[PDB]
Amino acid sequence: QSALTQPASVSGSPGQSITISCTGTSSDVGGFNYVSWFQQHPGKAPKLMLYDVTSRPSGVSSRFSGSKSGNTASLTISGLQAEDEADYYCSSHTSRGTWVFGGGTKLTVL
Amino acid sequence: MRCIGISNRDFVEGVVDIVLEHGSCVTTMAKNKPTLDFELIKTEAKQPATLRKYCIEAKLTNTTTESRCPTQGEPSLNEEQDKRFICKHSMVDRGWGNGCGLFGKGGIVTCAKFTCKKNMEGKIVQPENLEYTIVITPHSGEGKEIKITPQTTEAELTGYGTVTMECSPRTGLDFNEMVLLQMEDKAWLVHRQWFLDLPLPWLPGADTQGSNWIQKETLVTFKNPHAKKQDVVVLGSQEGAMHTALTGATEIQMSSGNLLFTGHLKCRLRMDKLQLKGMSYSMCTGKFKIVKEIAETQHGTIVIRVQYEGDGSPCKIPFEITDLEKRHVLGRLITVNPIVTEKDSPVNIEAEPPFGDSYIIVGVEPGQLKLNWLRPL
Amino acid sequence: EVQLVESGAEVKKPGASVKVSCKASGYTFTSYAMHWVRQAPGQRLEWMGWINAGNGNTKYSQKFQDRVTITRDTSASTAYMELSSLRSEDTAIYYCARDKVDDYGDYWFPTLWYFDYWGQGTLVTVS
Ligand SMILES: *[C@@H]1O[C@H](CO)[C@@H](O)[C@H](O)[C@H]1NC(C)=O
Structure with a gap:
């Protein structure tokens, strides 16, 4: 059983904005800013896309945005580019000092 | 006969009252009565109930x-x-x-x-639990093991009669204000409040589980x-910290669960039922041979081992402490009324010689034993 | 720069034991905690536990508490994870991912950017 509620798959037209949700509890997403997003293209290892909800690493495109309301965090990719068709996973550090992941979302560029 | 060798030996003159402590030996003498040796061997407490278990290492x-x-x-x-x-x-x-x-x-x-990791258990001792093991061995030169609890005994000694022993179990400790603190191997007797006031994690004596400290x-x-x-x-092992805390405390030589003590007593006995063995016997008309030579004890007395060679078999030994001219007696016997039970069996004779030079006699004129002893002071 | 390289592919029969290495390069290994995450075939990511490379302290997931054992080699910049009594469920790609430890060497709270760098992976096949 997945600890974080993530949608199965998402599809969007090239150049348009789309949002991926991540539902948690008061003991992980609801209580702490420790929220991260990972991009995983088939075969490759996961790549840290967003951390501390909003923040993003150095070699990461500024199209990717982060949001958080109550126990729900959102990944927003404004302007869909070609090499976006990948698997996205949200993660959180719990109150108990452990790490939880989401189901995952398959993004389709169409 | 056992007290010959022990430095802590007391001589009692009977008709009495004797004081039995650990390591100490008591020799009782009474006219026309056999000499007896009394010794406290074990002052152990039977089944001790645990009061509290303290954790020393965690x-x-x-x-x-x-x-x-x-x-x-x-x-x-x-x-x-x-x-x-x-x-x-x-x-x-x-x-x-x-x-x-x-x-x-x-x-x-x-x-x-x-x-x-390591613990200790201070136990409960009631005066009623104490088992005193007093041994009574008559001074013959050849012995019942009597047990006494605070709740008189008729010590029947084979071929002599009976001892009318009655003891006062007051050593001097009040076992209500006291705790028997056992620690791995060693054990101590400490005050109640002191034990209950120790700053260590604990479990009630009743606890078997050994978890909810x-x-x-x-x-x-x-x-x-x-x-x-x-x-x-x-905070690390409190083992050594505890040993320092228990300096003045009375140690307990416990051997695998059971706890043995360093006792004390104020016994009273009655020599009325005691009788001297071999009174209807003859005299040994043969000759003797010194098995073991004359030796002065830690106290003024002298011991001697001899073996009867004659055919007299159960007979009384002619023993006399006299001068060079055989004129008069001077000393007294500790092993009262010596007897050769079997000629091929040796006989130990304790006697108190007079001060200065004297002569010890073993047997009659043919093959008679003449031994000079000079007693100090 | 930073390169996390775990041992090659290994095939193991059920009930056996797997040991997977993870060599850290291009950074101070001793001042980082190595995390272990398993990727099931076409499924969600599972956090297994971590090892503070400094002191050697570990924290395991309840799911793997008495099956997984994480170890470290300070002298060879490698992090090892041993999984005992393996089942058909354990058929997954195993990933090692770093995270910085506090300046004093303790690891109460992690750093905001937790899995900034990962390893290539290791497919453990159960036959
Ligand atoms: C307690 O810790 C040990 C490791 O020291 C571990 O093997 C054991 O599974 C743990 N027990 C529980 C109940 O978590």
């Missing part, structure tokens, strides 16, 4: 933690209701840096499985000096 395992951001209440663990763990709540600096939306003190809770906080100190981290720390 260890921390299975560390778990939960934390909250500021203004989100105190955290909770499932280990908090488990009394096998030492649990402690605290406060730590929180903010943007450690995933908190607000800056302030965030509540943290830590739980750790306290386990006991009270006062675990004595051995475990929780330190949070910079509001960053809450740390656990055991």
Whole structure:
């Protein structure tokens, strides 16, 4: 059983904005800013896309945005580019000092 | 006969009252009565009930933690209701840096499985539990093992009669104000309040489980000096710390569970039922041979081993302490009325010689034994 | 720069034991905690536990508490994870991912950017 509620798959037209949700509890997403997003293209290892909800690493495109309301965090990719068709996973550090992941979302560029 | 060798020997003149302590020996003498030797061997307490079990060495395992951001209440663990763990709540600096939306003190809770490595058990002793083992061996030169509890005995000694022993079990300790603190191997007798006031984790004597330790906080100190981290720390083995605390305390030589003591007594006996063996016997008309040569004891007395060579077999030994001219007696016998039970069996004779030079006689004129002894002072 | 390289592919029969290495390069290994995450075939990521490379301290997931054992080699910049009594469920790609430890060497709270760098992976096949 997945600890974080993530949608199965998402599809969007090239150049348009789309949002991926991540539902948690008061003991992980609801209580702490420790929220991260990972991009995983088939075969490759996961790549840290967003951390501390909003923040993003150095070699990461500024199209990717982060949001958080109550126990729900959102990944927003404004302007869909070609090499976006990948698997996205949200993660959180719990109150108990452990790490939880989401189901995952398959993004389709169409 | 056993007291010959022991330096702690007391001589009692009968008709009486004797004082039996550990290591000490008592030799009783009465006219026309056999000489007796009394010794306290074991002052053990039978079945001791445990009062309290103290933990002297401990260890921390299975560390778990939960934390909250500021203004989100105190955290909770499932280990908090488990009394096998030492649990402690605290406060730590929180903010943007450690995933908190607000800056302030965030509540943290830590739980750790306290386990006991080495322990000790102070037991309960009632005066009624004490089993005194008094041995009575008549001075013959060839012995019943009598047990006495505070709740008189007729010590029947084979071929002599009976001893009418009645003892006062007051050594001097009040076993209500006292605790028998056993520790791994060694044991001590300490005061009640002192024992109950010890700052160590404990379990009731009744406890078998050996897990839910009270006062675990004595051995475990929780330190949070910079509001960053809450740390656990055991205080290490209190074994040596305890030994120093129990210096003046009365030690107990316990041997595998059962606890043996260093006793004391104020016994009273009656020589009325005692009779001297071999009174209807002849004299030994043959010759003797010194098995073991004359030796002065730690006390003024002298011992001697001899073997009868004649055909007299059960007969009385002609023993006399006299001068060079055989004129008169001077000393007295400790092994009263010596007897050769079997000629091929040797016989030990304790006697008190007079001060200065004297002569010890063993047997009659043909093959007679003439031995000079000079007694100091 | 930073390169996390775990051992090659390994095939193991059920009930056996797997040991997977993870060599850290291009950074100070001793001042980082190595995390272990398993990727099931076409499924969600599972956090297994961590090892503070400094002191050697570990924290394991309840799911793997008495099956997984994480170790470290300070002298060879390698992090090892041993999984005992393996089942058909354990058929997954195993990933190692770093995270910085506090300046004092302690690891109460992680750093905002937790899995900034990962390893290539290791497919453990259960036959
Ligand atoms: C406690 O910790 C030990 C490791 O020291 C581990 O093997 C065991 O599974 C843990 N027990 C529980 C109940 O978590």
